[PDB]
Amino acid sequence: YARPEWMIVTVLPVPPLSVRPAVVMQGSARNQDDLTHKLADIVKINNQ
């Protein structure tokens, strides 16, 4: 159930869209959740 090597993050899990949904504010503007905002940086840095 637990291994030391599993303490190192080698692959990051992405929460479902329901856990971090995109709210709509000031019209049709899809306001992304705080997690989606950081996930965007994660994938950007990952690609970089």
Add this chain to the structure above:
Amino acid sequence: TCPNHPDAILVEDYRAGDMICPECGLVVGDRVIDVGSEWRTTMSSSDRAMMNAFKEITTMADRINLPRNIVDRTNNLFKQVYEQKSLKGRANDAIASACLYIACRQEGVPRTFKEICAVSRISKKEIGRCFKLILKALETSVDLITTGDFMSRFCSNLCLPKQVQMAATHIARKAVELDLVPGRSPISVAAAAIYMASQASAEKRTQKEIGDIAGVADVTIRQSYRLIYPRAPDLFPTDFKFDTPVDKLPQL
């Protein structure tokens, strides 16, 4: 996507926040609508430069008590220009000053370039240069200024009575309609009409006072006034009270 009635326009219900079949009553989705959302009932240089531009717009606007709606319009105009980048070479203060002039023009409350220059470190010339460049950058245009657009501010700044403001408006409007001031700047025409009406009223203001507040040289006022003075009785309203008759207005 009604299960039983394909292609059925489900009706949104605020009572539980769900969508119901328009001809069956079948509730589709438990409570997926989120009725509250539907019915109301460490800094990037680009953002920092934009933020700095906003701080300048609010400062310049405050000096002339411009309403917040004009500031919002100016910020949106600035953002488009800043994002379009056709004036990337120009200084943000010049761009902000020209955007502020455009916002006033778009809002229908034009401020002369001298007034915008008086609140900004950028000179009239650079604002004028940035002004046309922004119009090209935005592919937009602003309505032509008129003599009546300045009567309210100038007459109020001159503490002239309502009737004097109305008379100046009629005089300026009729002077333009009669084409008595060809090529003359509307500001020069407005100031001359204000001088004429003021000299005809109890509240008499000098060309210097009007020139200082309107931002027009007394010579320009004098020339514009000299052009309209001969037709003054046609320019004055029929329903106007003369403290000093039009026939006795200053000749110069």
Add this chain to the structure above:
Amino acid sequence: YNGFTGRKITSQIFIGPTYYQRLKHMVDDKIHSRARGPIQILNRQPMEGRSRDGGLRFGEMERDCQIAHGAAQFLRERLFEASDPYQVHVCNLCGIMA
């Protein structure tokens, strides 16, 4: 005199003009009800819609009361069935939701 029967009341009543004040607390401003109303999409729990239909918080004090009552079924309903009844599939081999 009794209004219903007209019979004199045995005791004489203290009666007289007294200055009364109506307070701003009206019942129509406080009455509210919630029954399968709008829920939060993120939390899937009750919230106010276009009225005061948001429900009552079944807090720790109420839970402890129901525990003392031993009404485990009602306690479960209020804390689960009446707020966010949900079911998920979980693997028996890995214990993770599938």
Add this chain to the structure above:
Amino acid sequence: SYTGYNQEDSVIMNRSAVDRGFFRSVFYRSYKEQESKKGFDQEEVFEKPTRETCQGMRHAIYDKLDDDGLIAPGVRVSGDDVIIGKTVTLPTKRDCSTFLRTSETGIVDQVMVTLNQEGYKFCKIRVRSVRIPQ
């Protein structure tokens, strides 16, 4: 101790006095709304939504609203009614009308339109609800 309905700090009132206006009062609730053009893509404005104007509209009656999107004084309103019809331009135009609460039931007493501190079109709607002692 007249029939016990006044026990534990309760009071019994004369229904005939209440019928005569005893302690009758009027409750005025003022609703304020403004139209702001912040963000060039969005432009909210007061106007009654129409089937062709808005891509999606509820079966709720907007007949209470005038052509300016504002309800007129002397009109009965309830939680089912709209007091202000506001629509915001989408990046079709969406509707962001202001509905009253289910508890809010009255008559529009006064509706003023002005330019607020921001210079934006601003309006205040005062709804009058008469509260009879009960």
Add this chain to the structure above:
Amino acid sequence: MIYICGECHTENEIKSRDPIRCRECGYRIMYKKRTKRLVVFDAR
């Protein structure tokens, strides 16, 4: 679409495009005219 100026109490017709400003008084507070619709009050 008639509004009453709050200062000069003058009925003036205003469109969606022209400003709220009073035609003659210049006052910027306008009150919508009372609805012409019939409202029934039981005298209770």
Add this chain to the structure above:
Amino acid sequence: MIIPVRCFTCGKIVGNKWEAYLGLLQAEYTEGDALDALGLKRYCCRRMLLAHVDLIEKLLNYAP
């Protein structure tokens, strides 16, 4: 704001006695004598006029 049409307690018409009452007070009648002259025998009816405050008089000082 204005004088009640009916006395809350008993229903007697008191809404037509206010200007009469004011006239008696202007005629130097004591408040009790004015109420007696108006025939307000029950103290519940007397309570209406003796304690009424006619604010409509003050509200009419504001332009329509």
Add this chain to the structure above:
Amino acid sequence: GRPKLGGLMDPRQGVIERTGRCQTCAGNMTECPGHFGHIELAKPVFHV
């Protein structure tokens, strides 16, 4: 105009709009429980 596969708002993670269904669950916003995405890290990371 639509979500893209392998993106932050990947349709496999769950339902995107209330009037839709995710391809993996084929269920609505309430039926779909949501699903996890994963980001393989080019370099292992210490878990805080």
Add this chain to the structure above:
Amino acid sequence: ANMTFAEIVTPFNIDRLQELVRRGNSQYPGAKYIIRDNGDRIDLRFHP
């Protein structure tokens, strides 16, 4: 009239419940919804 209790339809109450269904929300006592054996919910006020 705003709060409801879900009564299972039984031969003991089929007729009594059928009456409340036709009475609906406009008339109290009535009913708000019908849940069929399939688990689908029908709003009585929409189509009586």
Add this chain to the structure above:
Amino acid sequence: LDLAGPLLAFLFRGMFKNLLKEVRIYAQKFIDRGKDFNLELAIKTRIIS
């Protein structure tokens, strides 16, 4: 008891100190640039308002 006077005096003293501090920065920038400064522009009316 700090009434409206003492309370606003405490604010106005801080806001005026910020205003003068702001004037120095603006004026010094122009002086550093080698040009005179317009006092009318150095003042930021937003600080007190």
Add this chain to the structure above:
Amino acid sequence: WERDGAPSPMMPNEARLRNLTYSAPLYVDITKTVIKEGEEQLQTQHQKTFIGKIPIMLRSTYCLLNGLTDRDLCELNECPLDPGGYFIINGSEKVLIA
């Protein structure tokens, strides 16, 4: 100041109605002296330089409702009994608790 820039006296009723801030324009006389190391000084005075607006307490000596008779207050749609002593900030009557 109206959108066009016309200054106008603000009545408190208007401030409450239009959600304005009842503020008084604050001006200060400033004297600028420059010295250019040439044993000479140039003194320039900016008369009534605008520095901001101070929110005004109603019925204070600086308020428009100062010295007005009860009839004048009624004409302004103001209650003669209103004590004042509060500020109108964005249309909201704000009272400073001692």
